[PDB]
Symmetry: C2
Subunit: 334 residues, 2 copies
Amino acid sequence: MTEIATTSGARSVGLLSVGAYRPERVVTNDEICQHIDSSDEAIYTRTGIKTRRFAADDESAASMATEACRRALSNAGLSAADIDGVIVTTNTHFLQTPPAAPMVAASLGAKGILGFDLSAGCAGFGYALGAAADMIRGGGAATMLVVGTEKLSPTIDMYDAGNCFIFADGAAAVVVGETPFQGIGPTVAGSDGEQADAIRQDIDWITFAQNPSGPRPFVRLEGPAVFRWAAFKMGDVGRRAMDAAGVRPDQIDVFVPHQANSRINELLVKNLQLRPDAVVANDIEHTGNTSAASIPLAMAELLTTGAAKPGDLALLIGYGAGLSYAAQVVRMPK
Amino acid sequence: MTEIATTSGARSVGLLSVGAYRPERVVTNDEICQHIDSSDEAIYTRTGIKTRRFAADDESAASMATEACRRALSNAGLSAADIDGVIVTTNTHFLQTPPAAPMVAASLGAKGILGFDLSAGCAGFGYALGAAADMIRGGGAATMLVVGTEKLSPTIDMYDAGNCFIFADGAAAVVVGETPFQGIGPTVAGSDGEQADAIRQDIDWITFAQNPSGPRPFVRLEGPAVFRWAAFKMGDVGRRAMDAAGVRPDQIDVFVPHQANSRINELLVKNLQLRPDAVVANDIEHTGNTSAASIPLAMAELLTTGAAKPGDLALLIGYGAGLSYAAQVVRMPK
């Protein structure tokens, strides 16, 4: 009997561009210490954060995603029509349904293209990238939009003196398409579910809905557990991503780790054995932790400043919520 | 300069098995009719639903997902150690974070495997399937677990005579791996953002959180709009999926559309132009609309009753929320 046919596309794919959308409101550490017993320097030393952006009450994960996709398109000198699918990665979409992918697409003027929402915590960008790369090479699409968008501020607990100054809002997208040379290395991902409560929402929405007059949900973070994990585990992950990419550590030019903690990342940079002149993203200082949007936003800045240059060999390492991680070597877009 | 390396996997992948878990509680029409002004017949003739399962309070999307994965494993004659990654698709995970995927992986005794959550409405299964297939072929994995799990019950408004008898709970997983012959055809998907409000959550969790005294969030469905969309658009989708899989209509053995409405699917079976003896899933009659778990659960039944046998050529068509759709031809598992 007949066999089920297959499809395929360009085996060579990369980042054609990156677009970033940063909320207007600039929240300082002192503006946060209006409710916490800490200081400007106390936070900056323990976290490496000075300020971060917060989104307006009417803005959402979806609205910022679209806005970041429009810039990623422009920067790629593309039209919405040139996109065959969009993957939206986020953890702050506050509607069980409908997903946001099709919404985004509609606002972009391609309401009909394929797309879905992907959640894997602050490391959702790495999975979406690999997923888009696999789909293109599999012939499911020719060019795609991968956007990380987060609006964590509304989920932050004013009084929580352990993370109210960590999370921030934001969104950034990248265009993935065929390239004359391989631009996206193999994905190296994994997880540790036995520490799923390290980064979490303390109370589920249905339990809360059942008692409204009771405690409201809020994002919780056991910084220590996450610190020990990230700082001393993402080193091997990085070496695995570079290994599957066939590149030497001293061959990378840009290192973009998830902007969770500057003290974590300085640990990593030292562990990865990179070139003393490698460009490291320190974006967190003024962006804070934007979860799934983190890496994308960071890439966008290194490009803007011009520390990083289109075509540089970068190491992307995403880690966070539910204790999941995604890594891969890629070539910096535009 | 140097080369970003490229990986590769088996080119031929398929469904190795399917496992289904349906909640113990069996809710009848009359029970849902206690709270509405509708009838047993009235529902059954409009919808084709007579009974539906409901998960206990102590259960959740995650717990049922694990349960269904354990059966998919046993049915595939595998252990958790044989899985390289799990994709959890759902829209009833009541936590913004952490991701469910790693949690179900931990319960299976494989906390380290890669994995993420995917939401694309009732059509999230099709995307996850394609995504797994693409990953395997891409060498990012050899064997994966794709599970659709839903716990819609907690989001139902007993007082809503327009959809309080359509949604039900459940879960079901499949093992995807290398197979003698291609078992999963190319993916065909798309969406319709302009109709985002067709299946949705009236109030976002953050707006509600800022007013616990106000109306609680529920799931609202616009049956008519969805009906006119599904019934007269999923026909071309099906033809696309069969076209890309290099399969002719008459070749198809099993047609497994989303268990949305028996009347809808009834119209599709004709429009498709399958064989007069082509079997169709009628699982919805005692399962109801279980969103992302729908297709998987349906496949599991047709296999148990024997209406469908291992190796059969099936057409999967998922449609629903945020108005997204995913389709592909596959070979029924063993």
